[PDB]
């Protein structure tokens, strides 16, 4: 159960960072062209 909570926290942080980077990369590829 503590392992599940720690993995959940890691998943939340990874998802936040990945979504922000994906949005930034999509905006960059739409904007440069």
């Amino acid at each position: 159960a503590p392992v599940v909570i720690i993995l959940i926290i890691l998943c939340v942080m990874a998802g936040i960072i990945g979504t922000i980077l994906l949005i930034s990369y999509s905006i960059r590829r739409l904007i440069k062209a």
């Binding site: 392992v3 720690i6 942080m13 936040i16 980077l21 960059r28």
Partner: protein, 388 residues
């Protein structure tokens, strides 16, 4: 994107604040905590300042990584202890947080000069989880005696950094780099960290020991192990160099191997002569590693270790684990010998697996890694003054 590092730092800080709100609630060990704190933030910070053009990054990233690490390790270790429930913050939680920061800094010593601060934040976050799970496994499942944490801290961080550097291998840096060279005053500054680590290591090995006989035994064993390790490191450093010259790398690092190798047997009744033998063997092994095994790893195994943290933490850590196994076999401890062997093997394996995963994550060209030409240079991430 130049905004990756501040965005990631702010997001991580907000996450730490939220976690401390969700899971955290509210003195004779405080001086030992302060000694460990001084070790973590000064000894490791300045020990890596030997590079002539990477002192700023070494000390600053040490401070940043350890500051993030204490909070994240507090959260993770408390969650593992309380099975996902709330917990109180005492002095022992702060000591264990500094221990997690120590493990992350030991890993950071391997890839120093070839990584970005963003990569260091990511490596800290992942390595704390892996280290805390391994430490919980060793402490509560196997229930081994590792009060000085030769296996759970030093070996774990060393092999974690080795795996990360192996994944992050650069073909252009295998034959050396023009910035990978020490300076005179840089080595003088590194001696500050070396001396502070040497002076305060007994508190590192005796902070969380059981009060009474075990704590005193840990203090005395660590002190005499370091005392023997200094002499043997000087002797072998003179032995392995041309014309008996002393190499500053050896004096900076290998003099601290006695504290690492005595960590497992610190609270055991191994006697001061046994601690001195362990420290002597640790110093000899560290000097031999720096002289011969580091170029072998760099050129043949394609694993570059910037600070040579293998020769300081991994080999002395394995030596300390084997010494713990022997000491249990000799009746110096009432733990299981198979449990000590399992603890050493599990620490090494978990370190390797976590290092592989974290290095695969860090190899993504998103975190602002320096080019091969700009490695070991402060100007990539810092405003460097014009003069020295």
């Amino acid at each position: 994107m130049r905004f990756t590092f501040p965005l990631m730092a702010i997001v991580l800080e907000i996450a730490m604040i939220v976690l401390f709100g969700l899971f955290v609630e509210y003195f004779e060990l405080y001086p030992l905590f302060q000694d460990v704190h001084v070790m973590i933030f000064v000894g490791f910070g300045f020990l890596m300042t030997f590079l002539k053009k990477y002192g700023f990054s070494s000390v600053g990233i040490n401070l940043l990584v350890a500051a993030l690490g204490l909070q994240w390790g507090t959260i993770v270790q408390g969650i593992l202890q309380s099975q996902g429930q709330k917990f109180n913050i005492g002095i022992k939680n702060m000591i264990n947080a500094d221990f997690s920061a120590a493990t992350v800094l030991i890993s950071f010593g391997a890839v120093l000069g070839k990584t970005s601060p963003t990569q260091m934040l990511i490596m800290t976050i992942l390595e704390i989880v892996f280290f805390a799970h391994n430490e919980y496994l060793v402490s509560e499942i196997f229930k081994a005696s590792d009060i000085g944490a030769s296996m759970t801290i030093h070996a774990f961080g060393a092999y974690f950094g080795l795996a990360v550097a192996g994944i992050l291998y650069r073909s252009g840096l295998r034959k050396g780099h023009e910035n990978e060279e020490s300076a005179y005053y840089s080595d003088l500054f590194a001696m500050i960290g070396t001396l502070f680590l040497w002076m305060f290591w007994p508190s590192f090995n005796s902070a969380i020991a059981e009060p009474g006989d075990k704590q005193c035994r840990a203090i005395v064993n660590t002190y005499f192990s370091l005392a023997a390790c200094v002499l043997t490191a000087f002797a072998f450093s003179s032995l392995v160099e041309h014309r008996g010259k002393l190499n500053m790398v050896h004096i900076q690092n290998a003099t601290l191997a006695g504290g690492v190798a005595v960590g497992t047997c610190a609270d055991m009744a191994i006697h001061p002569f046994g601690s001195m033998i362990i420290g002597s063997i640790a110093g000899m092994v560290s000097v031999l590693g720096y002289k011969f095994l580091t170029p072998l790893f760099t050129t043949k195994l394609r694993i570059h270790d910037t600070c040579g943290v293998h020769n300081l933490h991994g080999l002395p850590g394995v030596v300390g684990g084997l010494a713990g196994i022997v000491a249990v076999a000799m009746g110096a401890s009432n733990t299981s010998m198979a449990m000590q062997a399992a603890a050493l093997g599990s620490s090494i394996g978990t370190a390797v697996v976590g290092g592989l995963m974290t290095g695969l994550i860090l190899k993504l060209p998103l975190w602002g890694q320096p080019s091969d030409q700009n490695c070991y240079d402060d100007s990539v991430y810092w405003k460097v003054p014009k003069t020295r």
